[PDB]
Assembly symmetry: C2
């Protein structure tokens, strides 16, 4: 059971995102917690490892249980912690080993190809400073079977 963090960094009405190779899906940058770290330490380190950018005061906004559901039972599960930040320092790296980095225009973000549960998270976090708690059930190919979000969309 892994623990993943990512950050959504908004600056001049744009959002720093990463597109997976081969015209794959768009994600917020981040990565896995290392033993002994707090979630705050992880997101600053992982984010910077992946983007070259230091985020100034990231704040937690989303806590999610991610479930892979198959043949009627839970077969995998991890945790995702989504931060938000508005201030940052450093130059964006052209390429990351996970994909290409791009500032996207805020109001275009919800039209990009992304896992369905990400869309809901982005829809709350892009427009609210409230905390979001949730569960997403996916099939092994990452088709959304269902979700529980609190507060509801």
């Amino acid at each position: 059971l892994q623990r993943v963090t990512n950050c959504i960094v908004v600056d001049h009405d744009q959002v720093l995102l990463l597109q997976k190779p081969r015209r794959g899906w768009w994600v917020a940058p981040g990565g896995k917690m290392e033993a002994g770290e707090s979630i705050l330490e992880t997101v600053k380190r992982e984010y910077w490892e992946e983007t070259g950018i230091t985020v100034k005061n990231p704040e937690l906004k989303g806590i999610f249980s991610m479930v892979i559901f198959d043949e009627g039972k839970i077969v995998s599960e991890w945790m995702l912690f989504t931060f938000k930040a508005t201030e940052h320092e450093g130059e964006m790296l052209k390429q990351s080993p996970e994909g290409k980095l791009e500032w996207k225009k805020k109001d275009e973000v919800l039209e990009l190809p992304m896992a369905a549960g990400d869309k809901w998270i982005f829809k709350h976090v892009l427009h609210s400073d409230r905390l979001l708690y949730g569960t997403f059930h996916y099939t092994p190919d990452f088709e959304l079977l269902s979700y529980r979000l609190d507060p509801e969309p």
Copy 2:
């Protein structure tokens, strides 16, 4: 690695706590995440099972990595998610299987016997509504070796 939640319920300057059997340490009531739940679902079910009480709108305030440190290596690690709540419904149970429940006065809490990491947590959460992130390093007997908290006390 397990995932524990608890809740600090402040009602008119009193805090609901649990004293472990043998006049041992005092804790906030709570319990471990089951597969598939969000942290918000866990704390309400666990809090209820332990106390008889329904916490109305708990909100996350503390996310901690707890580490047991022995012979110079991390030997054990778990996560604690601390919630805060003012409103609640239902009748407190006299006995629990984990120990005795009692409403204690807010300004007396820091003087109860408790693991040293919990003092820092109570010190912040009882007096602030800001998020606390941190790591506590313990010995197998729960003597605090160190901590990193943010915001720092």
